[PDB]
């Protein structure tokens, strides 16, 4: 993961940062196991807490998270570190982290020309999820 990369993904990150409510979106439907975790939406229906007030609070704070994981690549480690620390507990597992990134993946795809950007986000995702696995 080198500098080249990492501002390709910078720049395509920018682009759709201002979408926390799509990206959150395109994740519990990639995966209703990560939706159902949530004492504020287990047992809704998506299409209908999509646009509510607690969805956007959610998403700010999630997608806000990752927003700083990608402001500082590569140093990610003190953040990932943290990310365990409160997510361990909640018993997420590698089926439901991997869900989550086929759904932002999907998302990226559906609404940037993700072409371009590709291989530079598969060098971060593959880093970043590289590190996860290897502490929970
Ligand atoms: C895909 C598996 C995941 C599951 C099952 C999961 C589950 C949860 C749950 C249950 C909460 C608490 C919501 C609340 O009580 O209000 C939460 C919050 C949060 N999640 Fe995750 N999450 C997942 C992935 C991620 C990822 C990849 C990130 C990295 C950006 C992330 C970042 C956060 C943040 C920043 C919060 C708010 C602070 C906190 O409560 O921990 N989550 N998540
Ligand atoms: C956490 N989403």
Redesign the pocket.
């Given at each position: 993961l080198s500098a080249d990369q990492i501002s390709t993904v910078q720049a395509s990150f920018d682009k759709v940062k201002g979408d926390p409510v799509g990206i959150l979106y395109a994740?519990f439907k990639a995966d209703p196991s990560?939706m159902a975790?949530?004492?504020?939406f287990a047992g809704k229906d998506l299409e209908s807490i999509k646009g509510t007030a607690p969805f956007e609070t959610?998403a700010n704070?999630?997608?806000?998270?990752?927003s700083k994981?990608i402001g500082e690549l590569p140093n990610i480690e003190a953040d990932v570190n943290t990310?365990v620390a409160?997510?361990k507990p909640?018993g997420?597992t590698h089926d439901?982290?991997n869900?989550?990134r086929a759904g932002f993946v999907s998302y990226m795809k559906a609404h940037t020309d993700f072409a371009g950007a590709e291989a530079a986000w598969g060098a971060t995702l593959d880093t970043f999820f590289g590190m996860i696995f290897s502490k929970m």
């Open positions: 994740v990560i975790k949530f004492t504020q959610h704070r999630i997608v806000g998270f990752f994981i990310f409160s997510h909640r997420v439901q982290l869900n989550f």
